[PDB]
Amino acid sequence: ADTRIGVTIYKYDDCFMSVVRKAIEQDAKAAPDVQLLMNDSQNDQSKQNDQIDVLLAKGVKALAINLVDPAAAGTVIEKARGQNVPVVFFNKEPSRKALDSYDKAYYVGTDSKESGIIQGDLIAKHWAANQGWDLNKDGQIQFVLLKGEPGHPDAEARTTYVIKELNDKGIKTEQLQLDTAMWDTAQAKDKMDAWLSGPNANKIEVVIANNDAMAMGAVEALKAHNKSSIPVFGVDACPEALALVKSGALAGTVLNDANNQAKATFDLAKNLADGKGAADGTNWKIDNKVVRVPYVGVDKDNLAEFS
Ligand SMILES: OC[C@H]1O[C@@H](O)[C@H](O)[C@@H](O)[C@@H]1O
Ligand SMILES: [Ca+2]
């Protein structure tokens, strides 16, 4: 009969996870034997926990879980273990210890630091090509940074590695501001607006955001202050962001490959639901229960390949 797979998305109103959610539903449409039970956890781990209980009570044969809280992986694993059901975590990466605590736990995502390195290289390229961006002519990038959720592996790695990569390439940096905007456009717009309204706003040379949603908020705040001359960099290559790379409102971004992350999540979940090896009949390379999908930098010079 039909194989039910339970899926939780941490919040449907996340740009990137909306792409992933839709892609996984398209993938399921192409598997006549599988029924997806899709849940919006509304950015609340307690809601997600209850949703998982309901899915397990409905007899799902696998779970695909996009955690609200990464630290809740253990909690979720113990729920799955109660039914001896496999779980494919995706996009918010559990700790190695959590993954190793249950032989039926897997993870699909990315090499988080790669996105930071790529973003840093993009900034380095554009900085070298636009020395007018060095407003105070000190040879250093005076930056502000809009961080994702504290503790989220992508937020932590993108924040560390964008700056490390710039510095390693011989570009000194001065952090003027850094705060979280929780992956959200409105929070980022308000934070950027505050920074532009504070004393020494005039020192800001480059805006770095851990994702496109926050970058797009910054773009709007810059526009409101007639400061669009300041470049903004993001991560994801969300559809709206690519339009802004085209228009010049966004200086660069980094494709976070939602389509392939969705496909790997679905393929592994379906195999595990069927009691097969996770990668059976696929080309996915699973390394110690993890699949990582490459990022790719995007700017006007290669936009034609992504538009
Ligand atoms: O967990 C959700 C987050 O995942 C990250 O990989 C994406 O870059 C963000 O846009 C998204 O908000
Ligand atoms: Ca400078």
User: What is the set of domains in the chain, with CATH numbers?
Assistant: 1-110+257-294 (3.40.50.2300), 111-256+295-307 (3.40.50.2300)
AA identity, residue 24: I
Q: For ligand 1, atom 12, which residue shows the shortest CA distance?
A: 183
Chain position carrying tokens 């996984």: 24
Instruction: Work out the angle between the directed axes of helices 15-29 and 258-273 (0-180°, nearest 10).
Output: 50
| Separation of CA 142 from chain center | 25
Separation between Cα atoms, residue 56 and residue 97, nearest integer Å: 23
- Which positions make up the binding site for beta-D-glucose? 14, 91, 152, 154, 158, 211, 236, 256
AA identity, residue 277: G
Among residues 202, 255, 193, the alpha carbon closest in space to that of 229 is found at: 202
Among residues 7, 10, 9, the alpha carbon closest in space to that of 182 is found at: 10
| Residue 128 burial class via C-beta count within 10 angstroms: exposed 0-12, middle 13-18, buried 19 and up | exposed
Query: Residue 8 carries which DSSP code?
Result: E
What is the SS3 assignment for 56? Answer: helix
HSE value, Cβ hemisphere, 13 Å, CA-based, for 63? 34
AA identity, residue 197: S
Separation between Cα atoms, residue 303 and residue 201, nearest integer Å: 31
- Count of residues in the chain: 307
AA identity, residue 133: W
Is the Cβ–Cβ distance between 126 and 107 less than 8 Å? Answer: no
Q: For ligand 1, atom 11, which residue shows the shortest CA distance?
A: 16
Is the Cβ–Cβ distance between 298 and 215 less than 8 Å? Answer: no
Separation between Cα atoms, residue 194 and residue 157, nearest integer Å: 25
| Residue 22 burial class via C-beta count within 10 angstroms: exposed 0-12, middle 13-18, buried 19 and up | middle
CB neighbours (10 Å) of residue 44? 15
Q: Which two tokens stand for residue 54?
A: 């309901």
Residues whose CB is less than 8 angstroms from the CB of residue 22 and which lie 6 or more positions away in sequence, other chains included: none
- Name the method of structure determination: X-ray
Q: Which two tokens stand for residue 153?
A: 């592996």
Main-chain dihedrals φ then ψ at residue 108, nearest 5 degrees = -120, 125
What ligand 1 atom has the least distance to the C-alpha of 15?
A: 10
Q: Is 184 in the pocket of ligand 1 (CB under 6 A)?
A: no
Strand order in 3-9's β-sheet? 34-40, 3-9, 62-65, 87-90, 105-109, 290-292
Is the Cβ–Cβ distance between 212 and 180 less than 8 Å? Answer: no
What is the biggest distance separating any 2 CA atoms in the chain, rounded to whole angstroms? 69
Q: After which residues is the chain broken (C to N over 2.5 A)?
A: none
Separation between Cα atoms, residue 202 and residue 180, nearest integer Å: 21
Among residues 96, 98, 107, 59, the alpha carbon closest in space to that of 265 is found at: 107
Pairing of strands 253-255, 87-90: unpaired
Q: For ligand 1, atom 5, which residue shows the shortest CA distance?
A: 154
| Separation of CA 234 from chain center | 11
CB neighbours (10 Å) of residue 17? 20
Residues whose CB is less than 8 angstroms from the CB of residue 227 and which lie 6 or more positions away in sequence, other chains included: 196, 201, 204
Residues whose CB is less than 8 angstroms from the CB of residue 93 and which lie 6 or more positions away in sequence, other chains included: 70, 107, 109, 112, 153
Pairing of strands 253-255, 296-298: antiparallel
Cα end-to-end span (Å), the chain: 41
- Quote the strand ranges of 91-156, DSSP E: 105-109, 141-147
Separation between Cα atoms, residue 62 and residue 160, nearest integer Å: 35
Query: Residue 223 carries which DSSP code?
Result: H
Q: Is 235 in the pocket of ligand 1 (CB under 6 A)?
A: yes
Q: Is 121 in the pocket of ligand 1 (CB under 6 A)?
A: no
Residues whose CB is less than 8 angstroms from the CB of residue 243 and which lie 6 or more positions away in sequence, other chains included: none
Pairing of strands 62-65, 87-90: parallel
Separation between Cα atoms, residue 167 and residue 124, nearest integer Å: 9
Q: Which two tokens stand for residue 45?
A: 């781990």
Residues whose CB is less than 8 angstroms from the CB of residue 229 and which lie 6 or more positions away in sequence, other chains included: none
Sign of the C-alpha dihedral computed for residues 117, 122, 125 and 126 taken in this order = negative
Is the Cβ–Cβ distance between 300 and 245 less than 8 Å? Answer: yes
Q: Which two tokens stand for residue 200?
A: 């020494």
AA identity, residue 26: Q
Q: Is 236 in the pocket of ligand 1 (CB under 6 A)?
A: yes
